[PDB]
Amino acid sequence: SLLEFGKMILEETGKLAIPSYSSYGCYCGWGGKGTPKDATDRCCFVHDCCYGNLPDCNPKSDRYKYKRVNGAIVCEKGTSCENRICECDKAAAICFRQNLNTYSKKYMLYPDFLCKGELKC
Numbered sequence: 001s002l003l004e005f006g007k008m009i010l011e012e013t014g015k016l017a018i019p020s021y022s023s024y025g026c027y028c029g030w031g032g033k034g035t036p037k038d039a040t041d042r043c044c045f046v047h048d049c050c051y052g053n054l055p056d057c058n059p060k061s062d063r064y065k066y067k068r069v070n071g072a073i074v075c076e077k078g079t080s081c082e083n084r085i086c087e088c089d090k091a092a093a094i095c096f097r098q099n100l101n102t103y104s105k106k107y108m109l110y111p112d113f114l115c116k117g118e119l120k121c
Protein backbone atom coordinates (compact mmCIF):
# COMPACT_ATOMS: atom_id res chain seq x y z
CA SER A 1 0.00 0.00 0.00
CA LEU A 2 1.06 3.63 -0.49
CA LEU A 3 1.33 4.16 3.28
CA GLU A 4 3.56 1.09 3.64
CA PHE A 5 5.71 2.29 0.74
CA GLY A 6 6.03 5.65 2.52
CA LYS A 7 7.20 3.95 5.72
CA MET A 8 9.69 1.86 3.73
CA ILE A 9 11.02 5.03 2.06
CA LEU A 10 11.51 6.76 5.44
CA GLU A 11 13.22 3.65 6.88
CA GLU A 12 15.57 3.43 3.93
CA THR A 13 16.43 7.10 3.32
CA GLY A 14 15.62 9.04 6.48
CA LYS A 15 13.39 11.30 4.25
CA LEU A 16 9.56 11.55 4.61
CA ALA A 17 7.84 10.22 1.48
CA ILE A 18 5.56 13.28 1.65
CA PRO A 19 7.05 15.76 0.79
CA SER A 20 10.45 14.45 -0.37
CA TYR A 21 9.17 11.94 -2.97
CA SER A 22 5.46 12.73 -3.48
CA SER A 23 5.91 15.55 -6.03
CA TYR A 24 9.50 15.11 -7.22
CA GLY A 25 10.44 15.59 -10.86
CA CYS A 26 8.26 14.17 -13.60
CA TYR A 27 7.54 10.68 -12.21
CA CYS A 28 7.51 10.76 -8.39
CA GLY A 29 4.13 10.85 -6.72
CA TRP A 30 2.09 11.50 -9.86
CA GLY A 31 3.66 9.87 -12.94
CA GLY A 32 3.06 10.36 -16.56
CA LYS A 33 5.32 11.97 -19.16
CA GLY A 34 8.66 13.67 -19.76
CA THR A 35 12.32 12.79 -19.52
CA PRO A 36 13.09 11.94 -15.87
CA LYS A 37 15.04 14.80 -14.31
CA ASP A 38 17.74 12.78 -12.53
CA ALA A 39 18.52 9.37 -11.02
CA THR A 40 15.91 9.75 -8.25
CA ASP A 41 13.23 10.59 -10.82
CA ARG A 42 14.36 7.53 -12.81
CA CYS A 43 13.69 5.42 -9.69
CA CYS A 44 10.12 6.71 -9.86
CA PHE A 45 9.85 6.12 -13.61
CA VAL A 46 10.86 2.47 -13.12
CA HIS A 47 8.55 2.13 -10.07
CA ASP A 48 5.67 3.46 -12.20
CA CYS A 49 6.53 0.90 -14.92
CA CYS A 50 6.76 -1.81 -12.25
CA TYR A 51 3.21 -1.04 -11.07
CA GLY A 52 2.27 -0.93 -14.77
CA ASN A 53 3.36 -4.57 -15.09
CA LEU A 54 0.44 -5.35 -12.67
CA PRO A 55 -2.84 -4.33 -14.36
CA ASP A 56 -5.07 -6.35 -12.13
CA CYS A 57 -3.26 -5.47 -8.91
CA ASN A 58 -4.08 -2.42 -6.62
CA PRO A 59 -0.74 -1.03 -5.32
CA LYS A 60 -2.24 1.99 -3.56
CA SER A 61 -4.34 0.00 -1.11
CA ASP A 62 -3.24 -3.65 -1.07
CA ARG A 63 -1.01 -4.36 1.96
CA TYR A 64 1.99 -6.70 1.92
CA LYS A 65 4.30 -7.92 4.69
CA TYR A 66 8.08 -7.66 4.77
CA LYS A 67 10.89 -8.08 7.28
CA ARG A 68 14.51 -6.95 7.68
CA VAL A 69 17.31 -9.51 7.63
CA ASN A 70 20.01 -7.28 8.98
CA GLY A 71 19.47 -4.22 6.66
CA ALA A 72 17.99 -6.21 3.76
CA ILE A 73 14.30 -6.07 2.87
CA VAL A 74 12.71 -9.50 2.52
CA CYS A 75 9.20 -9.58 1.09
CA GLU A 76 7.11 -12.25 2.89
CA LYS A 77 4.61 -14.45 1.10
CA GLY A 78 1.06 -13.09 0.61
CA THR A 79 -1.11 -13.11 -2.54
CA SER A 80 0.64 -12.95 -5.91
CA CYS A 81 -0.29 -9.26 -6.27
CA GLU A 82 1.08 -8.51 -2.79
CA ASN A 83 4.37 -10.27 -3.53
CA ARG A 84 4.85 -8.38 -6.81
CA ILE A 85 3.85 -5.01 -5.35
CA CYS A 86 6.31 -5.57 -2.47
CA GLU A 87 9.14 -6.28 -4.94
CA CYS A 88 8.35 -3.08 -6.85
CA ASP A 89 8.38 -1.01 -3.65
CA LYS A 90 11.55 -2.65 -2.29
CA ALA A 91 13.39 -1.84 -5.54
CA ALA A 92 12.27 1.80 -5.47
CA ALA A 93 13.30 2.25 -1.82
CA ILE A 94 16.75 0.78 -2.55
CA CYS A 95 16.99 2.96 -5.67
CA PHE A 96 16.16 6.12 -3.66
CA ARG A 97 18.85 5.14 -1.13
CA GLN A 98 21.42 4.56 -3.90
CA ASN A 99 20.71 7.99 -5.35
CA LEU A 100 20.51 10.20 -2.26
CA ASN A 101 23.92 11.53 -3.34
CA THR A 102 22.23 13.45 -6.18
CA TYR A 103 18.75 14.14 -4.71
CA SER A 104 17.97 17.83 -5.42
CA LYS A 105 15.35 19.95 -3.65
CA LYS A 106 14.89 22.03 -6.83
CA TYR A 107 12.84 19.10 -8.20
CA MET A 108 10.29 19.18 -5.37
CA LEU A 109 6.86 20.43 -6.56
CA TYR A 110 8.22 20.25 -10.15
CA PRO A 111 5.72 21.84 -12.58
CA ASP A 112 3.89 19.55 -15.04
CA PHE A 113 4.61 21.67 -18.22
CA LEU A 114 8.35 20.92 -17.92
CA CYS A 115 7.52 17.22 -18.36
CA LYS A 116 6.68 16.47 -22.00
CA GLY A 117 7.00 13.42 -24.24
CA GLU A 118 6.54 9.69 -23.87
CA LEU A 119 9.26 7.46 -22.54
CA LYS A 120 8.53 3.78 -23.06
CA CYS A 121 8.94 1.29 -20.13
Ligand SMILES: CN1[C@@H]2CC[C@H]1C[C@H](OC(=O)[C@H](CO)c1ccccc1)C2
Nearest residue numbers: 027028029030031044047048051059060
Ligand atom coordinates in the same frame (compact mmCIF):
# COMPACT_ATOMS: atom_id res chain seq x y z
C1 LIG B 1 -0.70 2.00 -8.18
N1 LIG B 1 -1.23 3.04 -9.06
C2 LIG B 1 -0.79 3.17 -10.38
C3 LIG B 1 -1.81 4.10 -10.95
C4 LIG B 1 -1.85 5.07 -9.77
C5 LIG B 1 -0.87 4.37 -8.90
C6 LIG B 1 0.56 4.82 -8.77
C7 LIG B 1 1.29 4.41 -10.03
O1 LIG B 1 2.59 5.07 -10.29
C8 LIG B 1 3.19 5.74 -9.12
O2 LIG B 1 3.78 5.04 -8.31
C9 LIG B 1 3.14 7.26 -8.93
C10 LIG B 1 4.32 7.75 -8.11
O3 LIG B 1 5.56 7.53 -8.76
C11 LIG B 1 1.84 7.73 -8.34
C12 LIG B 1 1.10 8.69 -9.02
C13 LIG B 1 -0.12 9.13 -8.52
C14 LIG B 1 -0.60 8.62 -7.33
C15 LIG B 1 0.12 7.66 -6.64
C16 LIG B 1 1.34 7.22 -7.14
C17 LIG B 1 0.66 3.24 -10.78
